[PDB]
Design a protein around this motif. Structure first.
Motif, PDB file in Angstrom:
ATOM      1  N   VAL A 242      57.068   0.776  49.816  1.00 36.71           N
ATOM      2  CA  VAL A 242      58.148   1.625  49.347  1.00 36.71           C
ATOM      3  C   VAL A 242      57.825   2.125  47.955  1.00 36.71           C
ATOM      4  O   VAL A 242      57.420   1.354  47.082  1.00 36.71           O
ATOM      5  N   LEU A 243      58.046   3.407  47.721  1.00 32.53           N
ATOM      6  CA  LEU A 243      57.664   3.990  46.453  1.00 32.53           C
ATOM      7  C   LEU A 243      58.813   4.512  45.616  1.00 32.53           C
ATOM      8  O   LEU A 243      58.716   4.478  44.393  1.00 32.53           O
ATOM      9  N   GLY A 244      59.867   5.033  46.222  1.00 27.53           N
ATOM     10  CA  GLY A 244      60.946   5.615  45.455  1.00 27.53           C
ATOM     11  C   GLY A 244      62.013   6.097  46.405  1.00 27.53           C
ATOM     12  O   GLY A 244      61.863   5.972  47.613  1.00 27.53           O
ATOM     13  N   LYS A 245      63.097   6.629  45.856  1.00 27.51           N
ATOM     14  CA  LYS A 245      64.222   6.988  46.711  1.00 27.51           C
ATOM     15  C   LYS A 245      64.719   8.375  46.365  1.00 27.51           C
ATOM     16  O   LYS A 245      64.990   8.666  45.205  1.00 27.51           O
ATOM     17  N   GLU A 246      64.843   9.209  47.368  1.00 28.73           N
ATOM     18  CA  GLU A 246      65.442  10.530  47.308  1.00 28.73           C
ATOM     19  C   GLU A 246      66.936  10.391  47.568  1.00 28.73           C
ATOM     20  O   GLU A 246      67.519   9.336  47.315  1.00 28.73           O
ATOM     21  N   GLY A 247      67.585  11.465  48.000  1.00 26.80           N
ATOM     22  CA  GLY A 247      68.975  11.327  48.381  1.00 26.80           C
ATOM     23  C   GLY A 247      69.181  10.443  49.592  1.00 26.80           C
ATOM     24  O   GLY A 247      69.558   9.284  49.442  1.00 26.80           O
ATOM     25  N   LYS A 248      68.865  10.925  50.778  1.00 28.16           N
ATOM     26  CA  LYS A 248      68.945  10.082  51.951  1.00 28.16           C
ATOM     27  C   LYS A 248      67.576   9.776  52.511  1.00 28.16           C
ATOM     28  O   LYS A 248      67.470   9.358  53.657  1.00 28.16           O
TER      29      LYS A 248
ATOM     30  N   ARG B  14      55.193   9.963  52.388  1.00 28.76           N
ATOM     31  CA  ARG B  14      56.055  10.494  53.412  1.00 28.76           C
ATOM     32  C   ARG B  14      57.473  10.162  53.048  1.00 28.76           C
ATOM     33  O   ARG B  14      57.722   9.275  52.243  1.00 28.76           O
ATOM     34  N   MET B  15      58.396  10.845  53.670  1.00 30.40           N
ATOM     35  CA  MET B  15      59.797  10.577  53.464  1.00 30.40           C
ATOM     36  C   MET B  15      60.342  10.034  54.753  1.00 30.40           C
ATOM     37  O   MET B  15      60.043  10.560  55.820  1.00 30.40           O
ATOM     38  N   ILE B  16      61.109   8.981  54.666  1.00 34.09           N
ATOM     39  CA  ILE B  16      61.706   8.390  55.841  1.00 34.09           C
ATOM     40  C   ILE B  16      63.191   8.317  55.586  1.00 34.09           C
ATOM     41  O   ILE B  16      63.613   8.134  54.445  1.00 34.09           O
ATOM     42  N   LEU B  17      63.983   8.441  56.641  1.00 38.73           N
ATOM     43  CA  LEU B  17      65.415   8.280  56.520  1.00 38.73           C
ATOM     44  C   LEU B  17      65.761   6.880  56.076  1.00 38.73           C
ATOM     45  O   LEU B  17      65.220   5.899  56.562  1.00 38.73           O
ATOM     46  N   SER B  18      66.689   6.801  55.140  1.00 41.86           N
ATOM     47  CA  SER B  18      67.036   5.553  54.503  1.00 41.86           C
ATOM     48  C   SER B  18      67.750   4.578  55.409  1.00 41.86           C
ATOM     49  O   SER B  18      67.889   3.419  55.038  1.00 41.86           O
ATOM     50  N   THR B  19      68.216   5.002  56.560  1.00 44.52           N
ATOM     51  CA  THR B  19      68.831   4.067  57.469  1.00 44.52           C
ATOM     52  C   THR B  19      67.886   3.546  58.532  1.00 44.52           C
ATOM     53  O   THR B  19      68.304   2.727  59.346  1.00 44.52           O
ATOM     54  N   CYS B  20      66.646   4.000  58.555  1.00 44.12           N
ATOM     55  CA  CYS B  20      65.635   3.377  59.385  1.00 44.12           C
ATOM     56  C   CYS B  20      65.302   2.003  58.842  1.00 44.12           C
ATOM     57  O   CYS B  20      65.289   1.794  57.637  1.00 44.12           O
ATOM     58  N   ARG B  21      65.043   1.070  59.728  1.00 44.99           N
ATOM     59  CA  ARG B  21      64.749  -0.279  59.307  1.00 44.99           C
ATOM     60  C   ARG B  21      63.274  -0.490  59.106  1.00 44.99           C
ATOM     61  O   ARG B  21      62.452   0.346  59.447  1.00 44.99           O
ATOM     62  N   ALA B  22      62.952  -1.652  58.574  1.00 48.99           N
ATOM     63  CA  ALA B  22      61.587  -2.096  58.397  1.00 48.99           C
ATOM     64  C   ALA B  22      61.628  -3.579  58.144  1.00 48.99           C
ATOM     65  O   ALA B  22      62.644  -4.106  57.722  1.00 48.99           O
ATOM     66  N   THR B  23      60.540  -4.252  58.459  1.00 49.67           N
ATOM     67  CA  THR B  23      60.441  -5.674  58.215  1.00 49.67           C
ATOM     68  C   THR B  23      59.527  -5.952  57.045  1.00 49.67           C
ATOM     69  O   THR B  23      58.561  -5.243  56.816  1.00 49.67           O
ATOM     70  N   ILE B  24      59.819  -7.025  56.346  1.00 49.95           N
ATOM     71  CA  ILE B  24      59.132  -7.356  55.107  1.00 49.95           C
ATOM     72  C   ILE B  24      57.783  -7.970  55.419  1.00 49.95           C
ATOM     73  O   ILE B  24      57.700  -8.930  56.178  1.00 49.95           O
ATOM     74  N   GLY B  25      56.732  -7.451  54.814  1.00 55.05           N
ATOM     75  CA  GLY B  25      55.456  -8.132  54.782  1.00 55.05           C
ATOM     76  C   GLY B  25      54.403  -7.399  55.586  1.00 55.05           C
ATOM     77  O   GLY B  25      54.660  -6.400  56.240  1.00 55.05           O
ATOM     78  N   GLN B  26      53.193  -7.902  55.513  1.00 53.15           N
ATOM     79  CA  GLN B  26      52.061  -7.315  56.197  1.00 53.15           C
ATOM     80  C   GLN B  26      51.958  -7.880  57.600  1.00 53.15           C
ATOM     81  O   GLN B  26      52.358  -9.010  57.848  1.00 53.15           O
ATOM     82  N   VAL B  27      51.450  -7.081  58.529  1.00 57.85           N
ATOM     83  CA  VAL B  27      51.218  -7.573  59.876  1.00 57.85           C
ATOM     84  C   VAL B  27      50.008  -8.482  59.843  1.00 57.85           C
ATOM     85  O   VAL B  27      49.008  -8.168  59.208  1.00 57.85           O
ATOM     86  N   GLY B  28      50.088  -9.625  60.505  1.00 56.03           N
ATOM     87  CA  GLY B  28      49.015 -10.598  60.435  1.00 56.03           C
ATOM     88  C   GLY B  28      47.740 -10.293  61.190  1.00 56.03           C
ATOM     89  O   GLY B  28      47.458  -9.142  61.485  1.00 56.03           O
ATOM     90  N   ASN B  29      46.959 -11.336  61.474  1.00 55.99           N
ATOM     91  CA  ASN B  29      45.675 -11.278  62.174  1.00 55.99           C
ATOM     92  C   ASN B  29      44.687 -10.332  61.506  1.00 55.99           C
ATOM     93  O   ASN B  29      44.189  -9.394  62.104  1.00 55.99           O
ATOM     94  N   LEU B  30      44.354 -10.624  60.264  1.00 54.73           N
ATOM     95  CA  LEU B  30      43.712  -9.610  59.452  1.00 54.73           C
ATOM     96  C   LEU B  30      42.235  -9.491  59.696  1.00 54.73           C
ATOM     97  O   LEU B  30      41.640  -8.522  59.238  1.00 54.73           O
ATOM     98  N   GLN B  31      41.607 -10.461  60.325  1.00 57.43           N
ATOM     99  CA  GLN B  31      40.168 -10.412  60.451  1.00 57.43           C
ATOM    100  C   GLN B  31      39.722  -9.759  61.726  1.00 57.43           C
ATOM    101  O   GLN B  31      38.538  -9.787  62.035  1.00 57.43           O
TER     102      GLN B  31
END
Length: 274
Positions: free
Chosen positions: A163-169, A181-198
């Motif tokens: 997340v970088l900053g916030k516009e209006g919506k 990119r701009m995403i709608l503020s009511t779209c969800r997201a989960t915290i953290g990186q997706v695993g299995n990195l190797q």
RNA sequence: CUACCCUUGGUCAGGUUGAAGUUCAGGUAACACUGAAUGGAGGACCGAACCGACUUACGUUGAAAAGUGAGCGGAUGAAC
RNA sequence: GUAGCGAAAGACGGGUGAGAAUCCCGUCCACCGAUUGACUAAGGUUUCCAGAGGAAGGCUCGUCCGCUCUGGGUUAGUCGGGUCCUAAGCUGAGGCCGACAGGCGUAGGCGAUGGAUAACAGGUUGAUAUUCCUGUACCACCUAUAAUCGUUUUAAUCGAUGGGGGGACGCAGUAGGAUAGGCGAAGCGUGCGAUUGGAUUGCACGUCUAAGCAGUAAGGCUGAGUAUUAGGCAAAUCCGGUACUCGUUAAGGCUGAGCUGUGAUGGGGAGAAGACAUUGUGUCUUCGAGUCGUUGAUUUCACACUGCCGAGAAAAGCCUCUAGAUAGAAAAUAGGUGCCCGUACCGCAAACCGACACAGGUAGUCAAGAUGAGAAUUCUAAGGUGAGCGAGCGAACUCUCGUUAAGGAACUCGGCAAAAUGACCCCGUAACUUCGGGAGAAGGGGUGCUCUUUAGGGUUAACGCCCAGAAGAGCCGCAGUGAAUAGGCCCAAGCGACUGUUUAUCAAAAACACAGGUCUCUGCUAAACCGUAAGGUGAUGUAUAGGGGCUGACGCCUGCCCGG
RNA sequence: UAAGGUAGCGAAAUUCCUUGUCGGGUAAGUUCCGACCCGCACGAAAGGCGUAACGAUUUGGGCACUGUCUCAACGAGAGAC
RNA sequence: GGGAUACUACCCUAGCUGUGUUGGCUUUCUAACCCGCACCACUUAUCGUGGUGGGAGACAGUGUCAGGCGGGCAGUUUGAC
RNA sequence: UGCAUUAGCUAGUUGGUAAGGUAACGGCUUACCAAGGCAACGAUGCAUAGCCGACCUGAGAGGGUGAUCGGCCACACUGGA
RNA sequence: GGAAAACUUGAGUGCAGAAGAGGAAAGUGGAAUUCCAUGUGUAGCGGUGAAAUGCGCAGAGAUAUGGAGGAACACCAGUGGCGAAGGCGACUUUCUGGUCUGUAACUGACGCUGAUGUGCGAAAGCGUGGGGAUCAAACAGGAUUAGAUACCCUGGUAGUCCACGCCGUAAACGAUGAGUGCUAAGUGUUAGGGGGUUUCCGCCCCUUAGUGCUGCAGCUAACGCAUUAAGCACUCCGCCUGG
RNA sequence: UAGGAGCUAGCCGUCGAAGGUGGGACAAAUGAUUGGGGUGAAGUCGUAACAAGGUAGCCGUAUCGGAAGGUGCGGCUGGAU
């Protein structure tokens, strides 16, 4: 980690694989399974439309909870399991009344820890929130694109946006490919990186191991005949004797941009790469 | 018939080597290297069934509009 | 009156006939024997079995069938299919799209190659048999028969249009447990040999089902009880998370489990003639013949267990728990009852696909003794067959096969073809390497039979029972894995890393793939591709991803030019 | 016009002249191997150079061994009656 | 003087009061229209239809016309001596 | 005499147990027993060389030559009996 | 040489305290180059020995209550202290090493060299994950200069920083191997013990261990050394003998 | 008789020098060609180092450059301000 193989055959000379040490239960949940018949690149007219898809192992579909719906009810992580359908592993969560779901397993996630959803939730790894309530600078994954539709961006192994900053919506978000990119503020997201990195580091090793994943061979254009491909023909070996390299369907293939003009998301993309 | 593919089934005598790993001990003592037991991996090796088709001889108004004999490649796999 | 008559061992005696290398019977000989044997699919459709003439048919004759006549001949509650279930697909009311014709698609239908489902033993024909007959069972449905449950809410029953579980699934490997089959022996039976001897002697033999009683050999089990409840479109008394008591015992609590003993069966059958005046003495109405004891053991337990990555259908039948509903059942007996389709025959071939009675092709199952690691090799049992029209005599040349003095690649485009090597055991083994290998490197040696023996695998009880522990002493031959089967090796360069793929039918390669590189496109109704469109693949994926181009393991590397 | 070939290879699956020249191997070597560089007309992902293992690949030499050759008889089938 | 202000555009240097109404530009609105957009019912049914909330919005999409590009694909020719 | 740019040496070897047989001894060989014995004090091996008296020059500390000239060892084309 | 004893200086085990950048682990905060955003504004900002490349019309930087990152943490900082040496630096704490003084209680020399062996081993290099914020090989740009891309400048790659493996190398030099006796001084300074006055914490002085600076006899070829010897003696190891 | 015992002779197995190869190992010689070094002539170009030798050295190290040198990181003075 990653295990290296001892060179006992010429086919195992430089081959590595994952040790699967994050996997903690090696048997899926019976009620979350569906069939997944192969359709090896053939559409509803039955003709081959994308090349090089073939027949690998039989797999089954695990239904993943990409919209994190169940809200204000916490869940315990039961196991981290393997999934043949993606490059992340998955996590079985059990909600407080007994409903089991699968989710994408983030990077540091432990059997036993607690996971929840909503605006009321707090910022730790594996909680899902609207983008409005997520502080600027954190890394997120499994990002929706239309509110309620389910996560669509950054779901593969080792993927995240921040997340970088916030516009209006809208919020500003920097994707893994380096575009913002701009995403709608009511779209969800989960915290953290997706695993299995190797996952990116495993050397496949032998041709047939590629065939176990349903990849048929690919033959290059310059060794076909002139009715088959634009690069075809020529007496010996030959240079690509054209001003540009071509597709087999005859379009310029090495630098021509292909995004269409006048998409509605052109005003949402502030800065793009790749 | 043949080329790919999809779903659901089947088949593969016998031998040989001995991976990751484990474990005890010659040199052994800051076990530790390397000797022995274990273990059973592999588009591994030799070789029947099965699958192929490299040489050769024979056939060429052929037994046969592509075969037979002797050798030969593959033979747990990108197999049939 | 030429070529050819389609691979393979026949000979003689008898018979029958108008007439026999041909047909039938006999005896001997031979061939296949992981099959030229025995079953089951597909496919074919009367070729199946008896009689009688075959005018044609058969690379003859008829004195056979694959022409004629019928005489014919196919029997199922349990076998295989339908009255069940779904996969891939194919269709699809309404819907979308499209000059028309038409395309797509929703619930739904249809659809096995998979899931579910109850029978075995004996007798019997010229021709069918788990179908007929005899015995013994099992599974359903319907009607009577009785004690039992008796708000019909509930209650064992009903019972969802309801839920939870199950069904329900990879690949490799191992260790066991049973059992099929094979194996030696005095338990018991038959017979006693003509050419010399021997008479412990030549052999052979030992049985038998599904079902139903008992227990069982090992396997999985946070293994047995209390309260609560964002849920299971509502009911659940059933499914989950926790807080506890014996807790990790597996006692045996549970589910599931190969198999064993009794009865089934003093019946059948029996190595048996001991039973005939007969059924041409073959045949049978009567009348019995043993059910010992070792040895070592595929298939099943069970993808049980362990390991691994590539992460291994669905739906019903089924088991639970309920609303709800009614009386209310069921059960155990006795009765009835159990539809349709296939069924003959060939079937790794004379009946199928190949113009043919064609040296080809054709999915699955079973598979005895010796020898061996073996399903290899050679011989053989059982069982099949003597080859299918051709047969009788005896140079060049051609083809398959064997031998060769002296020499040993001098041949030739080229050691092409052949010869040589080969099994097992023991000793030994280089350069080079990516440390794996190279490697079965190369190169050496051994192998029969008899007796001691000390002793191994022990057959161990132990020398005896076989191979030997392997050591001594002998004997024979030209030769001892005495047959058959079983790698030729070394040195040096090209190309391609490798296994793999390719021009069905003149090219298998240095060509294609490949694991790796790298460039480039693509922010998701993605790009790309198919389609007029709808639809769709990509993908039930989301930049550690997907499409395109070029290169091609690995190691060291990859310079200059952006004017066109 | 924009530059004029760095490394490494080099009579090469690439060399016209050409069987180039010199050495090794043979009694005799157009092939082969090593070396030279005068690269007609090699050259760095239509990759350069190298490389263990692998090959019914191409190519050169050696040992075994032999009717392949210097240079006859026997057996069966066809042919011949 | 190197151009020039009488009438008249009339002025960059303009600043500007409001004017019947006409036509550009850029934002911003919603009713058109569109969401492989979310929730809820028909439903048996996620196709489809309707309701509600969200996104987007006079754009896009589609029709007619124009213009560029177009070996991706086509019909031809390749004079003739 | 020197070399560790020779460190691990031996396996009838290492001790003993019995037969030899020698003018006598025993691992000297043969049947037995434990791996022992030998070692960086450099065993082992390599390379070099008959030894000593003697010569010779050194203040002494001494050490270099051997035709000499004496004493001892080894040899008699080679290798065995 | 062996045989029987002791003493403690020398060493170890005691006791009272000083200091810290001594190695491995947890916190608190500052400031900065880089980024994205507000305000802000528009012509230049950066860079230059000389100008320019660049970065500027998007607002480039700017600018602050305030948003972040990379990495360290001036001040106390010293011929200070500790470590064998490579070395050690914002600190608060953890676990410790070790130094030193003083009383000297005790064992009765329990020591030194140090072949083997084992460690550390600076920087760079072979590689991984945070690394590319700054710096920076290699590369780039602009011109200067008679000459370029050199002295000028930045951007910038690994390498950087750290953790995870090492390699075994430096002017790792005090160009002085290690342990013990003895011979002119003065002079500061680090820690402990000793005090006289006292001081309102300061003057003078004994001693120990040191840290330093000048300086006899002796020394060498001379430099220079001279209590932190290259002087006068003893013991051990190692090394050397023309380039 | 010469039969036993012995002996010549006969066989029969233990050990043998040399041989025969066989593989190597080790050593020496030679080899078309080559590449480091020394001497001469320094034929030639440049001037790096010695003067703060025009842009201080030096070590370890690392990279580029044909070389000289170029740079970079730790350490040393055996250096000017």
């Amino acid at each position: 980690a990653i295990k290296k193989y001892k060179p006992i055959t010429n086919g195992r000379r430089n081959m590595t694989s994952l040790d699967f040490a994050e996997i903690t239960k090696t048997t899926p949940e019976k009620s979350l399974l569906k069939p997944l018949p192969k359709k090896a690149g053939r559409n509803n007219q039955g003709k081959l439309t994308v090349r090089h898809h073939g027949g690998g192992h039989k797999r089954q579909y695990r239904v993943i909870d990409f919209k994190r719906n169940k809200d204000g009810i916490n869940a315990k992580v039961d196991s981290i399991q393997y999934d043949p359908n993606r490059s992340a592993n998955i996590a079985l969560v059990v909600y407080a009344d007994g409903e089991k779901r699968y989710i994408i397993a983030p990077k540091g996630l432990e059997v036993g820890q607690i996971v929840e959803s909503g605006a009321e939730a707090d910022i730790k790894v594996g909680n899902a929130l609207p983008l409005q309530n997520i502080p600027v600078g954190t890394v997120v994954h499994n990002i929706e694109l239309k509110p309620g539709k389910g996560g669509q961006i950054a779901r593969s192994a080792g993927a995240s946006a921040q997340v970088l900053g916030k516009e209006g919506k809208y919020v500003l978000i920097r994707l893994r490919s380096g575009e913002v990119r701009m995403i709608l503020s009511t779209c969800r997201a989960t915290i953290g990186q997706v695993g299995n990195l190797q996952h990116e580091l495993v050397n496949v090793g032998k041709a047939g191991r590629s065939r176990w994943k349903g990849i048929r061979p690919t033959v290059r254009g310059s060794v076909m005949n002139p009715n088959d491909h634009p690069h075809g023909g020529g007496e010996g070996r030959a240079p690509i004797g054209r001003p540009s390299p071509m597709s087999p369907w005859g379009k310029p293939t090495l630098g021509k941009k292909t995004r269409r003009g006048k998409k509605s998301s052109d005003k949402l993309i502030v800065r793009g790469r790749k």
